[PDB]
Give the backbone structure.
Amino acid sequence: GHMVSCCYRSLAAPDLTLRDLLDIVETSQAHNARAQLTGALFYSQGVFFQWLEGRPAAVAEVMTHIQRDRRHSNVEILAEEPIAKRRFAGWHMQLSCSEADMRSLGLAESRQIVTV
Amino acid sequence: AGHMVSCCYRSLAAPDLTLRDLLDIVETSQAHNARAQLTGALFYSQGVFFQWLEGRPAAVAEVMTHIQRDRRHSNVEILAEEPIAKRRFAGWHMQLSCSEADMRSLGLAESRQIVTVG
Ligand SMILES: Cc1cc2nc3c(=O)[nH]c(=O)nc-3n(C[C@H](O)[C@H](O)[C@H](O)COP(=O)(O)O)c2cc1C
Ligand SMILES: Cc1cc2nc3c(=O)[nH]c(=O)nc-3n(C[C@H](O)[C@H](O)[C@H](O)COP(=O)(O)O)c2cc1C
Ligand SMILES: CCCCCCCCCCCC[N+](C)(C)CC(=O)[O-]
């Protein structure tokens, strides 16, 4: 019971950008593997959802950076608790993209037909 | 009183999960969760179930007893149980992310047809 898990949800900045998501992914993947932080970040449809677990001080501090990040707002901690055993293997990223986010990147589906 | 709890778990979907199984889970859950006033959501993606459930402590603990011994998934890991003042979900629903490999496991395929229109 010498570790914590932390779980929060937040709302993306409405002007969040691909670059932003790309910065968050890259930063996230590298610091967490180094701080021994295990868990998962999900982004779908303007909402973030994240689990983190590890040393209490390493979680307490990554959450400190996260709670002041202007890339999201309304950071709502859903579960904080002493764990004795990590319940996630390393760090997992899962970003899903709807048609809305697609039209909202200038992107569209297109079928290619080539004469062969 | 009318205090409420929230429980969240992840699990591994049975390798041999079938469309019938998903039909059963959805029909059963919808019917019982409405009767027992359990709100939340079940997610399926790339072999994993994740469920969020809310309601009265006895109603959540009861459904979790059943969920935990259900042979349609294994490795049920409770991730959070927390007191809540209010529900974050209005009702209940299942959300499924369906891959090419999901399709083929269920013995299904899409086929496209071309159709004249105005
Ligand atoms: C939704 C969201 C999730 C994030 N998740 C992580 C993460 O798990 N690990 C991490 O090191 N930084 C994460 N960050 C980025 C940090 O808030 C922050 O940019 C990073 O710790 C570097 O801080 P610094 O700019 O003061 O050096 C996340 C940011 C957002 C908006
Ligand atoms: C991943 C998964 C999620 C489930 N979620 C619920 C649920 O939210 N509510 C529910 O009543 N049963 C749920 N069940 C079904 C129960 O485990 C159990 O089969 C049911 O309560 C008893 O069904 P019966 O009355 O038809 O015998 C779930 C099962 C699985 C495999
Ligand atoms: C019982 C209700 C059956 C509904 C079938 C819907 C599942 C379709 C999945 C198709 C997967 C194709 N992928 C994901 C690759 C996208 C595409 O090619 O358009």
About this structure: The CA atoms of residues 41 and 93 of chain B lie 5 Å apart. DSSP finds three helices and five strands in chain B. The domain at 1-106 of chain B is CATH 3.30.70.100 (Alpha-Beta Plaits).
